[PDB]
């Protein structure tokens, strides 16, 4: 446990291979009122959806928007 962060070379036997499924990295969010796109980067295991808007133009105003995510604009892996 002192070789952390190094670049290594190991060998062995591939055992219990899982299946390939997409990993979500960043999520797009359509404003529908201010017309911006909010982006949230997740590096944790789980996460949460976020609040109604975080624009600069929906900000400093009485009526903020209410958002929802989108699929085709997100980046997967």
């Amino acid at each position: 446990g002192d070789f952390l962060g190094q670049l290594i070379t190991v060998r062995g036997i591939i055992t219990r291979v899982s299946d390939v499924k997409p990993a979500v990295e960043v999520i797009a969010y359509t404003c529908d009122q201010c017309g911006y796109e909010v982006f949230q980067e997740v590096n944790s295991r789980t996460f949460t959806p976020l609040s109604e808007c975080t624009s600069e133009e929906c900000s400093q105003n009485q009526t903020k928007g209410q958002l929802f995510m989108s699929t085709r604009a997100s980046k997967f892996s």
Binding site: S44, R45, F47, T48
Partner: protein, 84 residues
């Protein structure tokens, strides 16, 4: 004139003119400041604009409200921990 200032003139743009008696000795308010949680070691910063009672220091160490796993996994700064 200063004689007639009704309650209908509350919080409205009213001008006047008179005679100034005497000033005071100058004190100081604060606008920008960096704080520290005396247990959690948690630092933020606070700006204010309309300083004219209005705001004070909060009463939670605020490191608990965090969108990161490993920091929220690692207690009580409580009570009001903030020292300027």
């Amino acid at each position: 004139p200063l004689r007639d200032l009704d309650s209908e003139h509350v919080s409205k743009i009213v001008r006047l003119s008179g005679i100034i008696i005497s000033t005071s000795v100058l004190s100081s308010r604060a606008t920008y400041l960096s704080i520290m949680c005396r247990n959690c070691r948690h630092t933020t910063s606070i700006t204010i604009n309309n300083f004219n009672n209005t705001v004070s220091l909060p009463r939670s160490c605020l490191s608990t409200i965090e969108s990161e796993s490993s920091m929220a996994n690692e207690k009580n700064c409580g009570p009001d921990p903030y020292i300027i």
